Design a protein around this ligand. Structure first.
Ligand SMILES: CN(C)C(=O)c1nn(C)cc1NC(=O)c1nc(C2CC2)ccc1Nc1cncnc1
Ligand SMILES: [Mg+2]
Ligand SMILES: [Zn+2]
Length: 315
């Protein structure tokens, strides 16, 4: 067989949750295939269809500061690390579907929130009244799957194809952060009452939802220099959206106002406490080997505190 390999440093460090995929775009499809071959298997996908699918997905991501091709592969790699360290817990269809869900989860993102689309009266807001962008991301995934020579699931039965698409659909919808709050609360009680049951499909759905949120935010789980630089990229988008809110004569929320740039360290503090820490805490309870995500999330929370006390800088 033709096995995918990586340089020595990458081969070792890709197994770490805090791996950064690096600045060479041309290496990211190779890295994604390697992760697919090792987490799923070399026979999960025809290599020629996968490559065509990968390059078609890449083409349908946009040149935006944060919600771009690099973010898709990064999110997929966080899922890879969760799968390799919990390998006994997941089905064949789930390994197949989830890495693909992660690659496709922000397809055709123009760098604007569901809220901006509602206030702008974007046509997508008419079509999908909730999880607007996320329903578009799924719609874009299905389009690509339906291109000639792009059916990477061609060997699945009709009912399997439908299950894996349903895994992908729910995984992509779960990245709507507005749904994460409710989902984490439900999973918290379920765990603390001992009712959570991984043979319960509606419970699997919620756990995978939580893995998708964890994967989606995994930029807060990287070494500090990666986390700090990546924060410029998301705020570059938040600020462009705030400008656009102002153009509609609407005051943006604080994190999207580029005039409130000096309040980023406190807004980050707010975000780690209200969102990130709860997220990885609950994920660590349910999947103990996902610990290093929460550790690295706490370490970066500590770094934002150092920035607020002026012991560290945010260039
Ligand atoms: C709901 N709330 C309160 C928020 O979304 C929120 N409020 N503030 C003040 C910041 C927020 N979010 C982010 O910073 C953020 N969001 C996403 C998701 C929503 C798009 C992802 C990463 C984020 N950060 C980040 C990224 N890469 C490196 N380091 C940090
Ligand atoms: Mg998204
Ligand atoms: Zn995302």
């Amino acid at each position: 067989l033709m096995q995918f390999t990586l340089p020595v440093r990458l081969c070792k460090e890709i197994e770490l949750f805090h791996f950064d995929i690096g600045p060479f775009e041309n290496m990211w499809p190779g890295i994604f295939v390697y992760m697919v071959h090792r987490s799923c298997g070399t026979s999960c996908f025809e290599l020629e269809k996968l490559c065509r699918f990968i390059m078609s997905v890449k083409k349908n991501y946009r040149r935006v500061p944060y919600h771009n091709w690099k973010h898709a592969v990064t999110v997929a790699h966080c899922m890879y690390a969760i799968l390799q360290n919990n390998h006994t817990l997941f089905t064949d269809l789930e390994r197949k579907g989830l890495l693909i869900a992660c690659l496709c989860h922000d397809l055709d993102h123009r760098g604007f929130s569901n809220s901006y689309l509602q206030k702008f009266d974007h046509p997508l807001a008419a079509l999908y009244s909730t999880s607007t962008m996320e329903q578009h991301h799924f719609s874009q995934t299905v389009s690509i799957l339906q291109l000639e020579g792009h059916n990477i699931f061609s060997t699945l039965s009709s009912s399997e194809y439908e299950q894996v698409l349903e895994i992908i659909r729910k995984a992509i919808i779960a990245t709507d952060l507005a749904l994460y709050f409710g989902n984490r609360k439900q999973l918290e009680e379920m765990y603390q009452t001992g009712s959570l049951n991984l043979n319960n499909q509606s419970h699997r759905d919620r756990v995978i939802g939580l893995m998708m949120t964890a994967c989606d935010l995994c930029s807060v789980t990287k070494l500090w220099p990666v986390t700090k630089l990546t924060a410029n990229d998301i705020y570059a988008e938040f600020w462009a959206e705030g400008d656009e809110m102002k153009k509609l004569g609407i005051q943006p929320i604080p994190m999207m106002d580029r005039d409130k740039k000096d309040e980023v360290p406190q807004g980050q503090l707010g975000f780690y406490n209200a969102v990130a820490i709860p997220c990885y805490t609950t994920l660590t309870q349910i999947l103990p080997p996902t610990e290093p995500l929460l550790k690295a999330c706490r370490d970066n929370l500590s770094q934002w505190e150092k920035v607020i006390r002026g012991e560290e800088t945010a260039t």
